[PDB]
Amino acid sequence: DDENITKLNKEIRAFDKLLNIPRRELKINLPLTEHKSPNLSLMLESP
Amino acid sequence: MVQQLSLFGSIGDDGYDLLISTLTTISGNPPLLYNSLCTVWKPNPSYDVENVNSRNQLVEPNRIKLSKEVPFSYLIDETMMDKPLNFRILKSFTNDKIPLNYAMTRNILWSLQISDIPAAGNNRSVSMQTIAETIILSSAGKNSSVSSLMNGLGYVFEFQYLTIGVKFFMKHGLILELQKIWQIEEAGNSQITSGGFLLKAYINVSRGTDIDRINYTETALMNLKKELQGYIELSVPDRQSMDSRVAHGNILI
Amino acid sequence: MSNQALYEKLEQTRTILSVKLAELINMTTIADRNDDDEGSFAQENSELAVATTSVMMVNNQTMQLIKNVQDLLILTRSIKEKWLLNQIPDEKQIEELLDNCIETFVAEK
Amino acid sequence: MQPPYIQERLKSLNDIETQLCSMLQEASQVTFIFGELKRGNESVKPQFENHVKQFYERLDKSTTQLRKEIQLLDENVGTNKKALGQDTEKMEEQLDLLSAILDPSKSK
């Protein structure tokens, strides 16, 4: 509604990529026969 | 339920801009736009409430207020999207006409609120009023609608109006409001606060028994009033004007 | 307030005019006047007290002129001080900027 | 810098006290000339009228202009804020510095 609150919200949201918690994901696909391919997904977080 | 301690006043639109600047010089905050829509409901006269204890006057019938916020997309006409959404738009709101008409409000049909006449006695420096409040979050059923709900309780619609203005937040929980009021009917829309702004400064107290807090609140309100001496005169309104019981009809506007 | 300053400057100006006329007449007829007619009113009875009254006039006009001028100057400065004091009056680019900064630090750390 | 209106206001005020100083100076010369006029040389008699007239006209219009200024005070009524944006501008400049840090070709 008011300009000031939206301006502050925009400026604060601009820093999300720095302030937010880092995350990582690693997907490992192992080559197996008999159309049986297990998957190994490891996600690393720092809560 | 709160004890609201309030002071009132009015100003002509000519000084409006100037007034705004002075407020920002004191509070250190910028104004924030807001709007609202209030509907007043009264007990149904078709039903005879013999339960009013006439020989004892345990209670008297009263009026219920239902309030809701309405987005500005209903209040801005085709000539006004160019300007940004800030307080200056109020400078164009001097005509008795307004984009929101009767049909849209009828299509709409929240916060439920009841109040009492202020405390008696002539040794009161600020208007002290008691308010009982609740909130309606949602509903369901075959007739889920505000009108059907209030008819289920036993109340019927009386009138409605629209407030548009600005808000200032100061220290100690003090809130200062500049308002413009538009009454709405099928016949049309009429601005009761014609050529001016209604000013209201108030604080809320959660518990009426605490008296140290009430004394502090009164001290803050009187200090604020004594700060604005010479520019605007803030006064205690008439105790008989803020009475909203059905038996006697008048409306401070 | 300002109206009081207006009035004060008013007696300031009229006092200047009156004391100016007084010192003018005193110095012009400082040469004592002797006229046989009863209409004239100029008396010099005690010889040296005449000079005392003369230096009286001198000291009065000096003090009053200096005080009035100084008061006017102080008034002007006060007005100027009141004038000075009382008159109350992209985001995306930042996103890639911070992204490059953080990746550069991560590589360099 | 201050808005221009204040600038010509202060210029007018400065003109006011300079005119007052000129009035005092002319009072000094008229007091000087009256002495020799009382002495008895009539050569500087014509200058006396001019000095008196200029002294009075300097005394009058200065007060008139000051009256105009005080009148301007009457209608000029009604005609930390920087902090509200101060952090913002600080923010801006800091990121600018980062840009200068981020580009090694501009650090020369």
Q: Per-residue DSSP letters for A2-30?
A: -HHHHHHHHHHHTTHHHHSPPEEEEEEE-
Cα D26 from chain centroid? 21
Element (H, E) at B50: none
d(CA C2, CA B210): 47
Distance from CA of A3 to the nearest CA of B (A): 6
From B158, B157, C27, B81, select the one nearest D38 (Cα to Cα). C27
Task: Please state whether beta strands B188-191 and B196-205 pair in parallel, antiparallel, or not at all (unpaired).
Answer: unpaired
Breaks (C-N over 2.5 A) in chain C follow: 89
DSSP assigned state of C36 = S
From C99, D97, D89, select the one nearest A14 (Cα to Cα). C99
Query: Which residues fall within 8 angstroms of residue B192, CB to CB, at 6 or more apart?
Result: B161, B181, B182, B183, B253
Counting every residue written for chain C, the total comes to 109
Element (H, E) at B114: strand B111-115
Residue of B nearest to A1 (CA): B85
> CA angle, corner C93, sides to C92 and C96, nearest 5?
90
d(CA B199, CA B193): 11
Query: Which residues fall within 8 angstroms of residue C106, CB to CB, at 6 or more apart?
Result: none
D97 touches chain B (CB under 8 A): no
Q: Determination technique for this PDB entry?
A: cryo-EM
B65 in Cβ contact with B114 (< 8 Å) = yes
d(CA B58, CA B160): 29
- Residues of D within an 8 Å Cβ radius of C: 6, 9-10, 13, 16-17, 20, 24, 27, 34, 38, 59, 63, 66-67, 69-70, 73-74, 76, 81, 95, 98-99, 102
C102 in Cβ contact with A18 (< 8 Å) = yes
The first and second tokens of residue A32, run together, are 């197996």
Could you give the C-alpha distances from D65 to C63, C68, C74, C76, in angstroms and in order? 26, 18, 16, 12
From B110, B107, B96, select the one nearest B74 (Cα to Cα). B107
Residue of C nearest to A16 (CA): C95
Distance from CA of B86 to the nearest CA of A (A): 5
Task: Please state whether beta strands B127-135 and B155-169 pair in parallel, antiparallel, or not at all (unpaired).
Answer: unpaired
Which of B17-25's residues contact partners 24+ apart within 8 Å by CB, and which partners? B17/B91, B18/D78, B19/B178, B19/B231, B19/B232, B20/B87, B20/B166, B21/C88, B21/C89, B22/B231, B22/C88, B23/B168, B23/B176, B24/D81, B25/C88, B25/D81
d(CA B198, CA B178): 6
Please report, to the nearest 10 degrees, the dihedral formed by the alpha carbons of residues C23, C26, C27, C32 taken in order.
180
The first and second tokens of residue A31, run together, are 């080559």
H helices present in chain C, as ranges = 2-28, 47-86, 92-108
DSSP assigned state of B142 = T
The first and second tokens of residue C100, run together, are 């490059």
Distance from CA of A2 to the nearest CA of B (A): 5
d(CA B67, CA B108): 12
From C57, C66, C58, select the one nearest C16 (Cα to Cα). C66
Residues 21-80 in D contacting B (C-alpha not used; CB under 8 Å) = 78, 80
Asked if C95's CB is within 8 angstroms of A17's CB, the reply is yes
The first and second tokens of residue B253, run together, are 């506007």
The first and second tokens of residue B137, run together, are 């979050």
Asked if A10's CB is within 8 angstroms of C98's CB, the reply is no
d(CA C66, CA C71): 9
Which of D10-19's residues contact partners 24+ apart within 8 Å by CB, and which partners? D10/C80, D10/C83, D12/D65, D12/D69, D13/C76, D13/C79, D13/C80, D13/C83, D13/D69, D15/D65, D16/C76, D16/D62, D16/D65, D16/D66, D16/D69, D17/C73, D17/C76, D19/D58, D19/D61, D19/D62, D19/D65
Asked if D83's CB is within 8 angstroms of B24's CB, the reply is no
